[PDB]
Amino acid sequence: PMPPSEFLDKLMGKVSGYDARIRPNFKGPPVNVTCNIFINSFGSIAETTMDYRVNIFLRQQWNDPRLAYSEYPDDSLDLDPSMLDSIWKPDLFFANEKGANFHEVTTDNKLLRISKNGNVLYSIRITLVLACPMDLKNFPMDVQTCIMQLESFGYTMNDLIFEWDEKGAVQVADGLTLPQFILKEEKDLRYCTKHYNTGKFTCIEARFHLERQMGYYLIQMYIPSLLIVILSWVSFWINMDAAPARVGLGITTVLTMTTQSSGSRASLPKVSYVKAIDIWMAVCLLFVFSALLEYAAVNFIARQHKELLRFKTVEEMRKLFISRAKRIDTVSRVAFPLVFLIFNIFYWITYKIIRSEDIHKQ
Amino acid sequence: PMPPSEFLDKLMGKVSGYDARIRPNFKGPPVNVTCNIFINSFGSIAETTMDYRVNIFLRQQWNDPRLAYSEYPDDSLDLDPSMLDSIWKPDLFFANEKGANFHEVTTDNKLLRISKNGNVLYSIRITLVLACPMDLKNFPMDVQTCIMQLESFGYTMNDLIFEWDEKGAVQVADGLTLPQFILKEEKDLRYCTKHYNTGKFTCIEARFHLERQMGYYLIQMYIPSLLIVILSWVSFWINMDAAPARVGLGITTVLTMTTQSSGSRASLPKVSYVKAIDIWMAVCLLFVFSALLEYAAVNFIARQHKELLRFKTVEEMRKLFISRAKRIDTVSRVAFPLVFLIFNIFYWITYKIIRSEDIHKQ
Amino acid sequence: PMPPSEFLDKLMGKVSGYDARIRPNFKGPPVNVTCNIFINSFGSIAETTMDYRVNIFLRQQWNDPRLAYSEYPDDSLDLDPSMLDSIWKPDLFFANEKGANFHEVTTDNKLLRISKNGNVLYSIRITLVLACPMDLKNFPMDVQTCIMQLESFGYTMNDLIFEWDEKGAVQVADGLTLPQFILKEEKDLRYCTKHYNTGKFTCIEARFHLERQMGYYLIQMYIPSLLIVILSWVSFWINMDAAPARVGLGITTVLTMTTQSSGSRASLPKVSYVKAIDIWMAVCLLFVFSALLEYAAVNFIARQHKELLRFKTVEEMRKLFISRAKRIDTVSRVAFPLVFLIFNIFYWITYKIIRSEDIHKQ
Amino acid sequence: PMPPSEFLDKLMGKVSGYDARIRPNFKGPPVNVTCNIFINSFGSIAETTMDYRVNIFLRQQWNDPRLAYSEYPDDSLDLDPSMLDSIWKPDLFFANEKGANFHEVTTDNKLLRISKNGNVLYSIRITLVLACPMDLKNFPMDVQTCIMQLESFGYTMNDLIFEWDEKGAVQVADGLTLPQFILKEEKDLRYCTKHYNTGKFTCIEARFHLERQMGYYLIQMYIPSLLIVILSWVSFWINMDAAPARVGLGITTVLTMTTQSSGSRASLPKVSYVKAIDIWMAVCLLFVFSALLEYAAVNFIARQHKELLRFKTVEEMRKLFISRAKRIDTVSRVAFPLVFLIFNIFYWITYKIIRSEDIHKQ
Amino acid sequence: PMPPSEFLDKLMGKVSGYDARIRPNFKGPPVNVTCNIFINSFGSIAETTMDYRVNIFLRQQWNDPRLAYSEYPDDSLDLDPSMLDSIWKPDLFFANEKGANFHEVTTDNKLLRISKNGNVLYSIRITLVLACPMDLKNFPMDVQTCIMQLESFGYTMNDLIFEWDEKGAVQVADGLTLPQFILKEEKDLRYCTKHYNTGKFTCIEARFHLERQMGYYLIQMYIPSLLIVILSWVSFWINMDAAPARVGLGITTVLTMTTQSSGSRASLPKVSYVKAIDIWMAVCLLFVFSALLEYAAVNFIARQHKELLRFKTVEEMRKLFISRAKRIDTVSRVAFPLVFLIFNIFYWITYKIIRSEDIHKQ
């Protein structure tokens, strides 16, 4: 029969047994809370500053022994988002966050709900930037583990405990469509206990798995580099007396490999250690290097063959140097695809096992 | 006969039946509102963080049963934009927004208008960044659907309903001139009902259609790549004994295709899956690959023809290998334009149908 | 004989006939104001988000019927920039602005001056980002019109009118030195009347003209492309039997044109429609395309000439095919500079007239 | 014997002859101030938005006729940085600044010190972005003058005067290490008098000199371009009958000059007028253009020599065309280094004098 | 038996001997503090604006002679992070910081703890951007020293002293994974005394060592440039009469060196002085320059050999010019690897000693 605004200001009023900066059931057992996270948006995964940015709906539920009506018909009251300083809220902060802020749309995006027995539901909508460290030892086949973890600030484990929800603790809205990665539905929820000098502190931690697509990285920087290795292998099927043809093919294949590598370096992320891409670019450059050194090793012999033709022993080394040159051009014609196939097997095997392993440790 | 500032402070005064944080006609039917959106500016459509940014004029109109004069000549009162906290405003927020803010020009860009019967008009001017997910499976021919949707924050469907306006709900100022897309005058306005555990929540949603121009993407990265495929086809019209001419044309056409592809990768947007552009760059590289492998398959036969001329059966395989080489150079001279025309037909058909389909589902 | 701070607080005091949120000479004729704009800095003209950023000194002058002394020696009073909320200020906002803010140097950059009769001078210093739409159909020869316009927010034309100053309304400080454009001293000042459902609203609008220099765009991407067209024309002066010389010149000229075009695409602004630069790059690529197709049309005839020399009628088509080839090499030697000169005349004429036209409409 | 906080609030108390918004010795001579600037950090010199950013320690010293103790042992009092609004401070602002802000570390970075006679020392620590216009007509050899100037806001020259300090007015902390320029120890301090309609306003102006290093710009884009001009000059020492050798050297030298120029354009700053770098790139491209046109002028004569050998007068023009060709190849072999050395002398002289001149005007 | 909030407001109450803006044990010995720094995150090391960004946990511990209970069971009290203005805090600021801010997660990230005797523990969590100057004279082998230092603001050394902690003053959380550098566990902690005109000011300074990995910089821009120098050395093993083969190898090796250098310039950081990378790119370009000038010096002699064969003295200079050419091709075949090996030894020695030296000075 009375408006609730004229009642909610008398529970936490001046003449009432309520202090705003005090724990519920003080000098007693610790008051635990139940958390829930609803991600609206996800992305801007940047490797230079090593972070990402989210929009979450953090919802907390805790019990409080006072603030009970037991004589009113309305079972749920709502507190005004201006005077949030009147109620007690548990000190929560994100451990690995860079920057965070509230939302400033036409209403203050806050919500407080007090039930009959004294249960409090507190749901906000915030956006924030979480730091995550990334390792790119195997870049176009990597998986990434991006975690979050939320602490207390000055309250011990015997004073305030955090708890994940039992059913649907972390929910993700449908249709996110990351530009680089693919998020997985693992969502494993763990615990940490911050052991300090003062005492143990509570922690809970969510953990997302991201897998990188290699579709674009296959069509571009892999198929052209493979095709130009096969194009460098064309010089094993051309006769030796056509000297500027095989030289012009060899050096231009090296030029094609360099402009293929250096033309793509602006698109790749920038780190100071080796990746999986530049090992492939190094071996692909070393093959077009070796297909020209094989030609220089052949042409030196055929040139000093012609120098001895200018000078049966005079012409026995003629047919000896011809059979020597053709046996080099045959054993290179057979050997050069085979060691590259052996390297490509050992490459794709040593990368599939390592990426598979990086998923099992979580 | 009295100034309105000395009257408007007595409607929502202390000794008056008004509470600021209470619903109109409380414990009754839900108070619906009528919304209107006027876009001033539109752009900064970024794909990396998957959002865009607007400047809107959000105008709301709702009825309120109290706050009526019925005895004053002025039919329209104006409230001061400083003390907006005195009146009740419906809690509205954008569901898929990243960040939002008001405008801070010489006056506070707010407006409140109270009519005779109690109708309230509330018009603000805000700027904000809406998240939209983009799919670029067919990049230079794509259409994009960019939506917005606006919710309540804590009020149920039986407590607060949203409604689009009947005539001219969403208006767009003239002369916007996006740098990438072209906006269409569809402006289809739909509804959503957020079904949660607590209850149904109201929603209305605007929906814009953007179509990407392919004028620049046709002149650049399509016409040069086609012309250099025709330039690679010149090597089917040159005689076989000119070996370094056709080799120097073939490898330099491959070099031209690689520097055409890798030179343009900084201008394209960055994703990890395949697009429509690099399928064309893959087939265009595979054609200049195959026009050199056809030459290596011809020159191997003409070289072992000359090797048997160094060694009628001795010269029957001479004319056999010549007719074999010329029949390969003829069937490649006829086949290579035809399968490329068949591929270009199947390409433009499989992209026109998919883009047309992406418009019908809206 | 008294300090003015102890007098200025009694004009707009509590017991005085002053209301802060009321119009001067209420229920009467509209109070007009006189505006003045002094630009300190100008630049950051960005095409991606389609805006620019200024630093202005907005100065307003209006009359007010009260607030007159008529008994004090000091003719000019100064109000403190903290308590600006005591006086009435006209609601002004920029219609096409993205974001705006004040200045927060050691003093609040505000100024209020009240004369004897009641004239008020109000001069602030603000910085703000105005949206402007740009059209780049003719990119390196374009002119741009960048306007600003300032409105009222909720006051009708019969309630508040805006007026430009008579002498020196818009002033520009000397030595601005834009990095891209050149500002002109046109400064044409117009009016708008915002016709809405509620009524007519006042507007005044400044309008700046910017002209883009083409000095860098002439030395780079025009002179090299022209010179390599003349370099492709060298292949009309070399004999036909030197086959790998003219082929190696032709394909490398095509390679030079592609690396000239794609090497410059990162420096150009990014739009989705055609510009004036890539039409020149398309015709310059089509010329080095046609100088190689002319060589393939010549070499096909001289090759089947040699094929008939392998096979007077046997040698009548010998001299017929030689006179046919030399007549093609002569008519291409004369035709290829002439149609390019005709195209370059029609190009520079169709661009000079369009740019000249874009200046006259203002 | 009393705490100073209980005394400093009674000098500027309510019942005391102090007004906060009033000039010292009102209706009298103007109160001058003494300024000092200590730069902590310097950099982010950006040419696109034409500004730079500093961190200064602005310190002011002025006299005030009241606020004297003459009966206390402590000669220096300190005011709390929260209630800075109690004291009078002179209105100072930077004329050519884009944006400015205070510092928000654990304490408010403010300082107030009141001596015995009434001298006030006011020292803050602020960071701010000053606009400077840059002219890049001679880019890799330019000097830049970057000034700052600080005004009053509404106080006339007969009301408030600014003054530089006598010894050490502008100090610079050691070890700044700009990434592009080198700062010089000139630090010339001048005056301005802002003549307006209202009256003269005071100004003082600091002025820094920055000199750009050309060490990187010499090793890269100068030495390779010079070396490839000498590489194009190799074609004057090769015999004429080796046609595809000299053609393949000539066009590839042109290709090397284009990929040297266009490969470096992303590193250069972006303006619309000419610089010193692209004049060198234009003349270096015109030399490799002229070394190929000299070859086409030679090969046309030697080809029509061979055409007349196909047709003593028949063979008198044989030796005439041979002596004509060798005299062209000799006079080009001697002329081409000499006019390039004359151009390189006139180039380095016309740039050294202009850069030297740009230092003397300051 | 009483709640601590009703006691903590009476220690620093109005009727109590506490002033907030006064030093503990005033007119006495200086109150020293003990500091501690815990870095959570580290990175965004940018060279253009010459700074980096951290997230620290600054913890201070000082004694205060008042504020003692000596009659309560709870030994540790906690102050509310809203009313931090009631207590005295020492004025601390970072000397070389660009910008700083607090954290605005659901609770104010502050902590105050008052022990029995009067010891105060004050622990905050802040993020801030420290300026550091970098020198890149030896870029891919450099070490960097990045310091921080924290001052007082207006308090003398005889009024406030800073002190590092004895055990674990600066701690670093595990698993940081910088994208460019590698942090070392040196953490040397020094002192500074700011000698000014007013007096000595206290300072303590932390100092981090960062070492740059050269793994990526070895695979890319070093191995390809070395391999193409060995590819340019192939032209010393090809006979002289194959003129367009060795010319086409030489100029294309120069083209490969230029597109290798200019293709990588976008990935390197931008400075105006020389580095270690472009000295290697200059010598690697000068080697492929000299391997073509050696060929022009050989081919000039063999061409004028053929010119004298067109004209025993007539043929004595034939064998003289042949033995002269082969002795040049032999002494270049032996000399060109040796002086490059001597240069590569003097290069790696002069860079290892300088980098080693830059570690010892700290």
Ligand SMILES: *[C@@H]1O[C@H](CO)[C@@H](O[C@@H]2O[C@H](CO)[C@@H](O)[C@H](O)[C@H]2NC(C)=O)[C@H](O)[C@H]1NC(C)=O
């Ligand atoms: C949750 O909070 C409760 C107190 O509200 C913690 O204390 C438990 O209280 C129950 C009920 O009296 C006892 O049965 C348990 O023995 C108490 N716990 C301990 C450790 O003594 C409780 O620990 C908190 N955590 C959980 C997971 O329930």
Ligand SMILES: *[C@@H]1O[C@H](CO)[C@@H](O[C@@H]2O[C@H](CO)[C@@H](O)[C@H](O)[C@H]2NC(C)=O)[C@H](O)[C@H]1NC(C)=O
């Ligand atoms: C709009 O608000 C009204 C109440 O102001 C809602 O209730 C309707 O009230 C009318 C008038 O009494 C009745 O005729 C309807 O039956 C009521 N609606 C229902 C669902 O019972 C109304 O629902 C709201 N919405 C619309 C679209 O009118």
Ligand SMILES: *[C@@H]1O[C@H](CO)[C@@H](O[C@@H]2O[C@H](CO)[C@@H](O)[C@H](O)[C@H]2NC(C)=O)[C@H](O)[C@H]1NC(C)=O
């Ligand atoms: C400027 O404001 C005046 C009122 O202060 C407007 O009204 C004019 O008042 C004058 C003086 O009485 C009359 O002569 C005019 O007829 C009034 N105008 C109209 C339209 O009736 C005036 O309109 C405003 N504008 C201008 C340009 O003066």
Ligand SMILES: *[C@@H]1O[C@H](CO)[C@@H](O[C@@H]2O[C@H](CO)[C@@H](O)[C@H](O)[C@H]2NC(C)=O)[C@H](O)[C@H]1NC(C)=O
């Ligand atoms: C500095 O301020 C003084 C007043 O405090 C200005 O006035 C001068 O006062 C002295 C002392 O009475 C006279 O000798 C001068 O003649 C006054 N100046 C003038 C222009 O009349 C003074 O002008 C200010 N400036 C300087 C540089 O001293």
Ligand SMILES: *[C@@H]1O[C@H](CO)[C@@H](O[C@@H]2O[C@H](CO)[C@@H](O)[C@H](O)[C@H]2NC(C)=O)[C@H](O)[C@H]1NC(C)=O
């Ligand atoms: C730390 O603060 C103390 C005062 O609290 C400083 O003064 C010292 O006080 C002790 C105890 O009375 C004396 O033994 C010393 O002689 C005092 N120091 C001096 C310089 O006179 C003390 O200097 C501060 N610093 C350190 C390092 O202790």
